[PDB]
RNA sequence: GGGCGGCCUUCGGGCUAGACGGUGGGAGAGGCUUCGGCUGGUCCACCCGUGACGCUC
């Protein structure tokens, strides 16, 4: 993944050597929160994987919470790059 | 929605010591498995990133 994780961070990132930023996580919580439940449909008896996805879906929430009460301007861009 | 909540400010702002992320590691009993594998937590380093984004009902 420190290629596929490593592309989403080049994509979302805000300046060259970004990584920490509100929206390099959210890109990366998005894409983890996807290959998760992709993940769920093969093996749908995982319940306890699940929990996981609940928490990452909560952490991405309040990440955004934080940036649209913080700097809409970025914000709007970030969920329209993406979905919501 | 409720309660609580970092540092400095001449209140306009400024921070990184919390939190999260990135990078590199630790664990003899995490879960599902079409057993050929997918997937959730968890602890530690840095002192790279964001910058209080936290905590609790």
Do not use: W
């Not at 990132?13 to 990584?19: Q, S, W």
């Not at 930023?21 to 995982?46: F, G, M, P, W, Y």
């Not at 940036?67 to 809409?72: A, T, Y």
């Amino acid at each position: 993944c420190k290629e596929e994780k490593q592309k989403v961070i080049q994509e979302f990132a805000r300046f060259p050597g970004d990584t920490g930023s509100t929206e390099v996580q959210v890109a990366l919580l998005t894409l983890r929160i996807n290959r998760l439940s992709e993940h769920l449909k093969v093996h749908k008896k995982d319940h306890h994987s699940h929990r996981g996805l609940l928490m990452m879906v909560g952490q991405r929430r309040r990440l955004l919470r934080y940036l649209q009460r913080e700097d809409p301007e970025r914000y709007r861009a970030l969920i329209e790059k993406l979905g919501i």
